[PDB]
Structure to design on (953 residues):
């Protein structure tokens, strides 16, 4: 037969615009296509994008940035009023630390 | 956090009970709703993590990754339904099932409190990816790609497993909170060196590290579009997340165990950027781009500074979005002309103007134009590397020059010049493709508007 | 006529129902970790004349 | 004379841009109006000392009405 | 650009091409018109001095020496016509050129404008469809058995024929499309 | 605006105008169909000069392979019209 096998020929690719000039590229069924477009646009842009951005923009300050700023303001005011240094090189009180007895 | 896990498990039978011509609509709608729900995880604290239960917790490092995963699922569904139109209903449902199972495994991986559960889920992600690649890939090379994808991973992860169980016999726990609080230094012995290597190599091969990256061009080129999207955007970040988790027990050994990996990352970043300059396949160029960006992320994780960790987090998120967008852009042209050769279809700006705008924006984000979060991550990593050693600015600097070049090269090859005369089948862009590009690109700039959400726990 | 509409679109409650069930299970999980409720040194507090527990 | 100018089809790109603008605005104009109305008629909370014996609710530790809600 | 090239250039063709190149570069050197005319007449005299050389070997040696002299004395920045391959407007309007087949993809609302133009387009497409097979048959007949040896194409010879492979030459976009 | 819409009559007029300013061609004896070599008795170098004069007149270049074939004013006019998309 000069052939190797019985096979279907490779078919040409279908253009969605032929049967539907305004086809949106979602489905060959025009109604299912239109509603796929509508749901993608409504739930992607209208709901998740804009409303999610608004929700994230107004998230309450659980990172405590403003609290930390106010605490630092109080600390700076007190330390500058009493003439103490603004910050100490030790963050732990040495009286609660017991060094080794001998260093030799 | 079962309020996110259970709806995906419900996506499964919802897909398998849907009418034959409503699978895509239902899957897309409920995937978008799940992403909206997962958006609430971004409310994080400044001191500790959100400890939901004994099994799951959310940090400031894993929450953006979860949001990216849940947002990527609907985009994958949108990108897949074009080339799967001729498929049977059962096989389409099986493909969607693979995507859903991958999302579930990733979601549970990013929030597991124990390292062995994390390992089990991080290996479980292998099966759906391999099935997708080897069943729905287009060319004969996909099979080989699958093998390269599998063993390269497993040869890294099998030692890690051993190390993990060994650690549990020594400290009594693999819970990450206990591991962090009860941390002890690693002495300088051969046993500790090999424990370090066992704990590091799996994540190294996942990034991937230069020299261990050969699986990635094969797997990311031979895969279908959704496979490439999820491989570039999320699955590469498993290595970075795991490394940033595991490095808490490796000090001070890392101080000198990082040198070969740092040298490999910097030089191979230069090398892969150079490789991008001479590439005939458009998908392979994007894959090697991913390799270069991940080399940057590896350097950031290895130098172990707060600025480097913030830069690594930002770079992972930005790269995920940008590389997924670039893969989709290349797939549009491939579906039009059925060939991946870059110089085949030229002058596409004359035929498709809006797609050319999408190409320009994607290539602009690839070269880290300020103030994109790509640039923020890159600059933070470069500053940390400069603190590590002033000479790094040379190599990093060279990278910044090469990247832009190849990026613009890609654009100039595809959009500019004159159109190919004999190609007469270039149809106007569909609404689906434009919506896909917009849903990729708009979150990038929105995140630029508020960058502290992707900067991590540091 | 709602029979055909229901049999065509009953798959649209699975994911919201899963969300509600996940919320319920998360509350149940929180119910099992109250061993230190109103007992930490930082947040220990005297009860109000009416309230029974500090959080649920 | 006036000659025909051969161009690619600009209908579909214009349609997509109009659809995207429509949906974004459809949800974002009410949001902007609501934000403006809330800001005008329900301002931000004023920082004050905790009165003796009072235990504030957690949402009372934030100042913007939308964040508090 | 329009004519099919031959397998090689002849001696006379090479001499004429060198003459044109030399005159153009001399004009590039001699900016003013009167000076250029003077030196161009001198160049023409120098060219036709050796016009009647019957020895071909000596003729090719003279041509070789002339080309070496030209390469030594060429203007490094010669004048180029703006639309010539080295000019400042060489491919300026290529981005405005759109192939005609794109019109097949216009939305019917876009085609609702310009009804007469699209009717004429349909007529042209019908003509091309009716002529193609006759063009192919004529090419099959006129081609030698060992394939074509040049890129020259035949004209139409029959009653209502069209010259084969005419569509993409006739429907060129334009020189100034938009 | 820009330059006027060149017509076939204008192209032919300018070509003949250039040719009648050539001292080697008799103006009266010249017609639009006169052959440069047969009718007018010119050689190849004169043809090269004529092609260059046409190029200077119309501000664009004619490649050598195309310029070799032009032998009468009508061929020059037709080549220029075809190049510049002149149909009227
Ligand atoms: C800076 C000005 C600020 C203006 C204030 C308001 C700006 C609102 C913009 C909103 C976001 C843009 C939307 C993105 C998608 C693109 C739209 C599209 O698809 O086209 C369809 C639409 C329809 O037109 P068409 O007739 O169909 O033609 C379409 C053809 O395809 C051909 O179309 P084309 O030829 O006209 O090209 C389309 C256009 C669109 O393509 C784009 O490139 C736009 C996307 C931006 C680039 C992305 C990578 C860069 C990384 C930076 C990230 C910045 C984001 C900041 C936060 C954003 C919040 C969402 O590209 C360009 O025109 C050239 C791009 C070069 C930009 C260089 C500037 C770099 C950064 C400079 C400053 C940025 C920070 C500001 C603050 C700095 C400190 C004060 O096109 C347009 O309407 C024109 C687009 C407008 C250009 C915007 C460029 C400036 C804005 C940059 C960021 C905005 C910052 C706002 C904060 C206030 C300051
Ligand atoms: C187009 C689509 C195509 C595709 C593109 C892609 C689109 C993607 C979108 C994705 C979704 C994005 C959603 C993001 C959510 C973010 C919302 C947010 O957080 O809002 C923040 C912010 C509101 O912050 P807030 O925390 O709510 O306010 C805190 C206070 O409690 C409030 O203070 P207050 O107590 O004073 O109350 C102020 C109140 C009232 O204030 C006033 O009334 C006073 C104003 C001055 C008037 C004074 C003179 C005028 C009257 C005199 C004459 C009448 C009186 C006498 C009568 C007789 C006449 C003689 O006004 C407001 O409430 C603020 C306006 C509300 C805007 C909310 C934005 C929501 C957008 C979400 C939708 C997204 C899509 C866009 C569609 C939106 C619709 C187009 O909104 C703003 O954007 C404000 C910006 C304006 C400030 C001035 C600009 C300064 C420029 C500096 C830079 C200079 C460099 C040059 C660059 C300039 C370029 C701009
Ligand atoms: C097509 C035509 C295009 C051009 C025409 C456009 C017309 C104009 C529209 C462009 C607007 C210009 C933008 C200028 C910025 C103004 C808004 C800004 O001020 O709001 C920011 C707020 O932006 C948001 O915070 C960022 C958006 C969050 C991004 C999340 C995206 C949604 C999820 C989608 C999927 C996720 C994928 C990625 C995974 C990581 C500031 O935040 P903040 O300084 O604090 O506010 C302080 C006061 N608060 C806190 C009380 C509110
Ligand atoms: C393709 C890319 C793959 C991924 C790349 C992975 C990178 C792995 C490289 C490992 C980095 C270092 C490993 C061990 C640290 C030091 C290694 C050694 O060379 O240093 C000296 C070690 O001394 C000598 O070199 C002894 C080692 C010589 C034998 C090792 C074989 C190396 C030859 C190269 C084989 C290629 C290996 C990779 C195969 C692919 C230091 O002297 P010393 O202080 O005493 O040893 C420190 C440990 N102590 C304290 C417990 C004693
Ligand atoms: C910018 C400065 C650089 C320029 C320097 C250039 C220097 C070169 C000057 C001298 C070059 C010569 O004379 S090279 C002398 C070459 N002589 C011959 O070949 C003799 C045989 N004759 C023929 O081939 C034809 O008659 C032909 C002459 C082609 C006429 O063509 P037609 O009659 O059929 O139109
Ligand atoms: N790890 C950082 C993350 C961060 C970055 C920027 C911010 O504005 C806030 C937080 C802390 O601090």
């Amino acid at each position: 037969p000069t052939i190797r096998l019985q096979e279907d020929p490779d078919p040409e690719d279908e253009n969605l615009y032929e049967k539907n000039p305004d086809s949106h590229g979602y489905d060959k069924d025009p109604i299912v296509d239109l509603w796929n477009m509508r749901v993608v646009f409504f739930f992607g842009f209208s709901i998740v994008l804009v409303l999610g951005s608004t929700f994230v923009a107004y998230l309450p300050d659980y990172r405590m940035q403003e609290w930390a700023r106010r605490e630092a303001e109080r600390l700076v005011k007190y330390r500058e009023a009493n003439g103490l240094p603004l910050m100490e090189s030790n963050c732990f009180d040495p009286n609660k630390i017991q060094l080794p007895e001998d260093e030799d | 956090m079962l309020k996110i896990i259970i709806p995906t498990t419900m996506l499964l039978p919802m897909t398998w009970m849907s009418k034959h011509n409503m699978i895509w609509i239902n899957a897309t709608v409920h995937s978008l709703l799940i992403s909206l729900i997962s958006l609430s995880l971004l409310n994080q604290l400044g001191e500790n993590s959100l400890n939901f239960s004994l099994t799951f917790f959310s940090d400031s490092l894993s929450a953006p990754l979860l949001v990216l995963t849940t947002w990527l699922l609907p985009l994958m569904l949108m990108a897949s339904q074009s080339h799967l139109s001729k498929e049977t209903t059962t096989r389409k449902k099986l493909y969607i099932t693979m995507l859903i199972l991958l999302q579930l495994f990733l979601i549970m991986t990013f929030t597991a409190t124990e390292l062995i559960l994390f390992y089990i889920l991080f290996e479980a992600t292998l099966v759906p990816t391999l099935i997708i690649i080897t069943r729905w890939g287009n060319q004969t090379e996909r099979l080989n790609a699958g093998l390269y994808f599998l063993f390269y991973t497993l040869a890294g992860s099998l030692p890690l497993l051993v190390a993990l169980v060994y650690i549990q016999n020594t400290t009594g726990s693999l819970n990450f909170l206990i591991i962090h609080y009860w941390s002890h230094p690693l002495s300088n012995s051969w046993s500790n060196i090999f424990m370090w290597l066992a704990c590091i190599m799996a994540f190294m091969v996942k990034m991937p590290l230069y020299g261990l990256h050969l699986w990635l061009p094969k797997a990311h080129v031979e895969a279908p579009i959704a496979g490439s999207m999820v491989l570039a955007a999320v699955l590469l970040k498993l290595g970075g997340y795991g490394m940033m988790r595991i490095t808490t027990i490796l000090n001070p050994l890392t101080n000198y165990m990082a040198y070969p990996f740092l040298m490999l990352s910097m030089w191979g970043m230069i090398m892969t950027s150079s490789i991008c300059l001479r590439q005939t396949d458009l998908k392979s160029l994007i894959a090697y781009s991913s390799v270069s960006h991940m080399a940057l992320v590896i350097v950031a994780i290895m130098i172990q500074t707060p600025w480097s960790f913030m830069g690594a987090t930002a770079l992972m998120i930005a790269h995920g979005l940008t590389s997924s967008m670039l893969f989709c852009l290349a797939n549009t042209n491939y579906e039009r002309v059925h060939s991946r050769t870059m110089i085949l279809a030229r002058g596409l700006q004359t035929l498709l103007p809006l797609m050319a705008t999408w190409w320009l924006v994607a290539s602009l984000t690839n070269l880290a134009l300020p103030p994109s979060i790509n640039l923020i991550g890159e600059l933070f990593i470069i500053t940390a590397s400069f603190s590590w050693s002033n000479i790094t600015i040379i190599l990093m600097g060279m990278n910044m020059m090469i990247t832009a070049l190849y990026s613009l090269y890609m654009l100039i090859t595809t959009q500019r010049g004159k159109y190919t005369h004999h190609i007469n089948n270039i149809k106007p862009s569909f609404t689906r493709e434009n919506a896909l590009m917009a849903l990729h690109i708009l979150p990038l700039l929105l995140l630029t508007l508020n960058p502290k959400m992707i900067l991590g726990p540091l | 006529n709602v029979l055909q509409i229901v049999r065509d679109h009953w798959v649209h409650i699975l994911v919201p129902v899963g969300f509600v069930f996940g919320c319920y299970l998360d509350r149940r999980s929180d119910e099992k970790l109250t061993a230190f409720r109103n007992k930490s040194l930082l947040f220990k507090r005297e009860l109000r004349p009416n309230e029974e527990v500090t959080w649920k | 004379k006036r000659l025909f100018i051969i161009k690619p089809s600009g209908f579909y790109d214009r349609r997509f841009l109009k659809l995207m603008r429509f949906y974004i605005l459809l949800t974002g104009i009410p949001v902007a109006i609501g934000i403006t109305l809330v800001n005008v008629f329900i301002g931000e909370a004023e920082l004050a000392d905790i009165p003796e014996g009072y235990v504030p609710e957690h949402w009372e530790y934030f100042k913007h009405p939308i964040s508090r809600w | 650009a329009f004519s099919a090239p031959a397998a090689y250039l002849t001696h006379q063709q090479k001499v004429l091409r060198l003459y044109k190149r030399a005159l153009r570069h001399l004009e590039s050197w001699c900016v003013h018109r009167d000076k250029y005319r003077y030196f161009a007449c001198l160049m023409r005299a120098r060219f036709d001095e050796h016009k009647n050389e019957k020895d071909m070997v000596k003729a090719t040696q003279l041509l070789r020496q002339a080309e070496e002299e030209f390469w030594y004395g060429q203007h490094p920045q010669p004048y180029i016509f703006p639309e010539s391959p080295g000019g400042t407007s060489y491919e300026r309007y290529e981005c405005y050129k759109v192939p005609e087949w794109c019109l097949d993809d216009w939305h019917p609302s876009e085609k609702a404008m310009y009804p007469d133009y699209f009717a004429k387009r349909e007529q042209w497409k019908r003509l091309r469809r009716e002529s193609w097979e006759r063009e192919v048959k004529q090419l099959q007949e006129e081609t030698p058995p060992g394939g074509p040896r040049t890129e020259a194409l035949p004209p139409a010879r029959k009653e209502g024929d069209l010259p084969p492979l005419w569509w993409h030459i006739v429907t060129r976009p334009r020189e100034r499309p938009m | 605006s820009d330059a006027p819409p060149l017509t076939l009559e204008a192209i032919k007029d300018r070509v003949l105008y250039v040719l009648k300013l050539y001292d080697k061609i008799d103006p009266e004896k010249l017609s639009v169909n006169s052959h440069f070599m047969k009718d007018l008795g010119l050689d190849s170098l004169d043809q090269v000069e004529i092609i260059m004069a046409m190029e200077d007149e119309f501000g664009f270049e004619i490649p050598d392979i195309d310029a070799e074939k032009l032998m009468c004013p009508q061929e020059i006019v037709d080549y220029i019209a075809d190049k510049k998309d002149v149909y009227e």
